[PDB]
Amino acid sequence: SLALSLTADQMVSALLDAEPPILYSEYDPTRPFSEASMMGLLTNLADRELVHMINWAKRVPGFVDLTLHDQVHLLECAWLEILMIGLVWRSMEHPGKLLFAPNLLLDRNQGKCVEGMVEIFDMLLATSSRFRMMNLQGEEFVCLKSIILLNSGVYTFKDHIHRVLDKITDTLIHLMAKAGLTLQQQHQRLAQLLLILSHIRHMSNKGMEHLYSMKCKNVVPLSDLLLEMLDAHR
Amino acid sequence: KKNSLALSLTADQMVSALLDAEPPILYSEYDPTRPFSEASMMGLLTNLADRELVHMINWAKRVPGFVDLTLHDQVHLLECAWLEILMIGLVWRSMEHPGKLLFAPNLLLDRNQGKCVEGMVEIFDMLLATSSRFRMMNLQGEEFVCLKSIILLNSGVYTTLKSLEEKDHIHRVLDKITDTLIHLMAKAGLTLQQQHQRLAQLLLILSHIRHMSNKGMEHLYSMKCKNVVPLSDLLLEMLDAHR
Amino acid sequence: KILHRLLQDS
Amino acid sequence: HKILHRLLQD
Lengths: 234, 243, 10, 10
What we know:
Chain A is mostly helical. Chain A is built from 8 helices and 2 strands, in the order αααββααααα. In chain A, strands 1-2 form a two-stranded antiparallel sheet.
């Protein structure tokens, strides 16, 4: 494979160059939202982000080497985690708020408009505040997001994927050792980042159940692509 | 509170404390002479998990740093992690039984028998895949007790100024358990590259255990409403903490 | 809570 | 018969 032959810096640059853009929400935002208007802006935004994520995944080293069937399984199981960790990363320099879009910055009080969304909101704000206190670097963020893509669905099927996961691990340690962190601080910071992935998985499971709740209580029509990504978790 | 014993012990002392605190493997009321349905298979499993929860709670008291926390924090951590800890213990006991889950020494279940319960098939396959992974990695008991203690402290720490020092104390114990895992891998002859890789592989499995736990919690909520499998009062209180 | 009590029982 | 198949190829 071509992903294993890369170097730690060439792996960082290839992931940074593959980063999807920050999309905008539908403008003319009426300052107070309703339950349907807020979910309308969110499902529309998430649907367009999914198109960019699918093309971002191809640019992940080692992802094209997998079969078409395996690429489908990994994205279907990881898509909400990847949207969430991206949202969390965008909201780092905005404490107490979630930056869904540059023109859509929401507070936790605005999460009270949709039932069951305040719990997911607080979990997302807590993840962003955790990234801020750790001073998460963008080079580390793109590594964590690729780890989510390749790891979250590999057990519901393997050697190649695990070889790429080890390759990314070598890249995380390389970045931390460049920042001057001691040998003890490197594996301690490596563990702290990877444990947050467990909570990102938890938020995705709680978020997935909430989206399924809106499917049968259809106040906002979900796109067919968003429905197929949602149906794959049942 | 002050002068935490967890922060002033070496790695080999961390292993000894965790190994000495291991709960016992409990037996089931399963009768192999009489096969019965999924409603009774789940009855055995819910009875077993209820008795296992009692030992888990007293096991958590012996985890370094857990007594230092307040009672409200101890309740929260267990309420969110209890199913993950049951599941990683189940997966650990099933390592040396390929294709089967050892719920109890007298209850070794096939995936075909777990299909009797509606929805248990996928959760059985994930637990099997987790057990096959631990077998592939040759997971050691010293690493399992570290991972299980990491689950207890980490799974509920994200869900005023004095509480920040409480979460900081939890991350202090978590960092020291990480040192213990690296200490174990260095003793097994692994290079610094192999230690970091194996450390990542172990912690990434914790993401799948959270996934299995979340999906497993949804099925327990379905059994309660179906009201066909008897659920003890403790399991109902733990299940209400997630819904 | 039973968990609240079981953690308290000593 | 899924859209994700199409976007992964185009």
